A = this chain, B = another copy of it.
Amino acid sequence: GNNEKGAIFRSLHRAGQPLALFNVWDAGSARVVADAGAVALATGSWSVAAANGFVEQMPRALMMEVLERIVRATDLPVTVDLESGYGERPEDVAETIAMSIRAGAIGCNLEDSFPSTGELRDVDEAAARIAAARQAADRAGVDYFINARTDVFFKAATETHDERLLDATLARARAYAAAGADGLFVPGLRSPALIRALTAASPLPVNVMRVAETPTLAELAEYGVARISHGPYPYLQAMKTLAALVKQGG
């Protein structure tokens, strides 16, 4: 049942032995990833939107329909990217999370940026959305993993990534943990020293994104990361293969 899937998913967040997730975008891709030995599935908002011909411009109901097809395609635990939570106010984000649970997801990514400007929400406004999500999950009686994404590093040029940004990231992480987040996702962060400092101080299991060849999975694990994401890389590789067939006359 979904609580057992939720428990399995939670248990896989292990500092130094990280959960690696590949984002799927439909039931076919879900099945392929599960058959290739994945231990859980994630959706990615970018991949799902691209697959469906969009640039939270995809309506929530259409995302939920996609999610249900993904969930029923395999027996693996599925986490869903809900972006900023498809809601103006905290109560609206709670409805979104509650709908994700009804759709059969056992966790989410919930991000702290405004879809209008891409700017960060105030720490406590962001935390209030997390708290509403936690409450919705708690009312459902489900074991549900809220992975709180912070865009502190993601929105900053790499050359500006330093201790001040790490400190801002950690202040958000503490607020988000207190509000009921289960994990912290910090995309855009690649510095070994900063990742080490983050995992040493974070109140929550840390998710980082792999983009370049470096750092590698083994390196990230050694820094103490608990979860590794790849964004739309899987979808983009699949589509590269498709485009090359077309050009090669294959």
Flag if A249 contacts B217 (CB, 8 Å).
Answer: yes
Asked whether any CB of chain B lies closer than 8 Å to the CB of A99, the reply is no
A242: chain B residues within 8 A (beta carbon): 22, 29, 32-33, 36, 234, 237-238
Asked whether any CB of chain B lies closer than 8 Å to the CB of A89, the reply is no
Asked whether any CB of chain B lies closer than 8 Å to the CB of A155, the reply is no
Asked whether any CB of chain B lies closer than 8 Å to the CB of A247, the reply is yes
Min CB gap A71→B, angstroms? 10
Proximity string of chain A (45-61) to chain B, C-beta cutoff 8 Å, 1 when within and 0 when not: 00000111100000000
Asked whether any CB of chain B lies closer than 8 Å to the CB of A28, the reply is yes
Flag if B243 contacts A241 (CB, 8 Å).
Answer: no
Min CB gap A78→B, angstroms? 13
Asked whether any CB of chain B lies closer than 8 Å to the CB of A102, the reply is no
Assembly CA distance A235 to B239 (angstroms): 10
A216: chain B residues within 8 A (beta carbon): 249
Min CB gap A212→B, angstroms? 11
Min CB gap A11→B, angstroms? 20
29 chain-A/chain-B pairs, Cβ below 8 angstroms:
A20-B249, A22-B246, A26-B26, A26-B52, A27-B51, A28-B50, A28-B51, A28-B52, A28-B53, A28-B235, A28-B239, A29-B51, A29-B239, A31-B50, A33-B242, A33-B243, A35-B243, A36-B244, A36-B247, A52-B69, A53-B69, A233-B245, A234-B245, A234-B246, A237-B241, A238-B239, A238-B241, A238-B242, A240-B241
- Supplied contacts A37-B247, A241-B241, 4 more A-B pairs, CB within 8 Å: A28-B51, A36-B242, A53-B73, A238-B239
